[PDB]
Design a protein around this ligand. Sequence first.
Ligand SMILES: [Cl-]
Lengths: 53, 53, 52
Amino acid sequence: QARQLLSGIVQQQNNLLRAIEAQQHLLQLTVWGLKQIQARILAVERYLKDQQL
Amino acid sequence: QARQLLSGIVQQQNNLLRAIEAQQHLLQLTVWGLKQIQARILAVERYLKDQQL
Amino acid sequence: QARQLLSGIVQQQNNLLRAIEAQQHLLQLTVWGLKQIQARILAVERYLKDQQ
Ligand SMILES: [Cl-]
């Protein structure tokens, strides 16, 4: 009752912490990937600038 | 008092869930965005390889 | 135990709140960064279409 309510609130809080932890991990991986493409574009710009007539 | 404290905590829990659901949509947009630029850079890299002398 | 448990729940709500605020900022920075790379790839694509 109070105990079931409190039990439910605890479990939902644990669910929400688990959900933000998953988002944090996916966002960390996305930011890493964006760093990788930044590198790739930079290399393509360097190339093109070196090849420029 | 118990009822007011527990109502405030339950309402906040719903508020937090809502905020995390909004950040999920944004996060998936960043994942989609990274995917689209990945494809675009790969398409350039390949063009530049194909066109080289 | 209930007042201590309630105290813990409320502290964890405040800390969830701070984590959501920090992830808002990181998402915003990540969007900005994406938009910057999109523009750079767009400029490359237009340059290449012009030299074709
Ligand atoms: Cl919560």
